[PDB]
Amino acid sequence: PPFISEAAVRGNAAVLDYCRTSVSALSGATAGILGLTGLYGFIFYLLASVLLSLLLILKAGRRWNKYFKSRRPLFTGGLIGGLFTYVLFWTFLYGMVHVY
Amino acid sequence: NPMVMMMVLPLLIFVLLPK
């Protein structure tokens, strides 16, 4: 805690964002495959993000203090840009299958 | 076209190189 290394923090943040974007990308494909309304779709996206965050916490478990100083980025992080990339793949396979 | 004219400058610059 007195001395902190920026390289490890950057790597941790990069890994976190990478998993957040991949899970969001797959969540978009699932919703596009099924096909729902906007309210249900947004709720489903939020549920998928919450499940990803819970799995991410379970991944660390013990000795998490050394890995992450806090837990706010784990809960609230990449919620808007991830939704921006999720909306694309949601409607990508939505109209490809149903409309076409 | 706005796009065709933005390629003609690289085309001329790349043509003037071997010459």
Binding site: - | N1, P2, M5, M6, V8, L9, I13, L16
Partner: protein, 282 residues
């Protein structure tokens, strides 16, 4: 060296006549320079007579890495314009200009190519206009030796016929005396003189003559700066037109300009044309 071009030839006198007063219009300009290369200009013109709002956002990208300049402008009538300038690429004084205009709301496109050759005392310029109505080619060549200068401008159109528009402009330009005579197809005959007595006194005289209806019109303008921040401009036309302008720097960047054109008679018929101008520079 670097002889004046056709458009710049005489631009001193017209600029004296042009800059200084904007009566009937409201001037509002903001210029901003960044640290690396970014230039931003936001100008707003407001009219009280016609009740019209006009403006353009101009973004300038000065790239000295290769001599490239990127300009993008936006107006209020949904008109988009882009410009690329390349100077000193492989030749000595060669300049290439590409201007394109496209509209996103409706569909309209316009193209313009400018080419300029500058040398010790030879100036060449060629503008090619590409539009659906008809392509046009306009060439201007300027030659001078020491102070004697003469330029030729020609405009040709392939759409209609062998139409050719001739322009011969002969002038004498030196340190403090600048005289220039422009001739259009032996029909328009303009003569402008401009001189500077001191570093505060500037005088300009303009004459216009025609061969068709023999119409002659002359006008004189005076520019005098009382202080480095206070300046005064006056112009008088041939018949009765008088215009007075006054400019003063208020804050170290902020400047206020006031313009008033008076057209009054003695038969109970008079009119005032007022205008305010204000600009910010950062």
């Amino acid at each position: 060296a670097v002889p004046p071009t056709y458009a710049d030839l005489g631009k001193s006198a017209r600029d004296v006549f042009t800059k200084g007063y904007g009566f009937g219009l409201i001037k509002l300009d903001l210029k901003t320079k960044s640290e690396n290369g970014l230039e931003f200009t936001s100008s707003g013109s407001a009219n009280t007579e016609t009740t019209k709002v006009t403006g353009s956002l101009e973004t300038k990208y000065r790239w000295t890495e290769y001599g490239l300049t990127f300009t993008e402008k936006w107006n209020t009538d949904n008109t988009l314009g882009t410009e690329i300038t390349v100077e000193d690429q492989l030749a000595r004084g060669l300049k290439l200009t590409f201007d394109s205009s496209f509209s996103p709301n409706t569909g309209k496109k316009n193209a313009k190519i400018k080419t300029g050759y500058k040398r010790e005392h030879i100036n060449l310029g060629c503008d090619m206009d590409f539009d659906i109505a008809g392509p046009s080619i306009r060439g201007a060549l300027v030659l001078g030796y020491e102070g004697w200068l003469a330029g030729y401008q020609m405009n040709f159109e392939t759409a209609k016929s062998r139409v050719t528009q001739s322009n011969f402009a002969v002038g004498y330009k030196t340190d403090e005396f600048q005289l220039h005579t422009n001739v259009n197809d032996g029909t328009e005959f303009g003569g402008s003189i401009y001189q500077k007595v001191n570093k505060k006194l500037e005088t300009a005289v303009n004459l216009a003559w025609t061969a068709g209806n023999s119409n002659t019109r002359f006008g004189i303008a005076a520019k005098y700066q009382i202080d480095p921040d206070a300046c005064f401009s006056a112009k008088v036309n041939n018949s009765s037109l008088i215009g007075l302008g006054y400019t003063q720097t208020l804050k170290p960047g902020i400047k206020l300009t006031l313009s008033a054109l008076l057209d009054g008679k003695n038969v109970n018929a008079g009119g005032h044309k007022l205008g305010l101008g204000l600009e910010f520079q950062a």
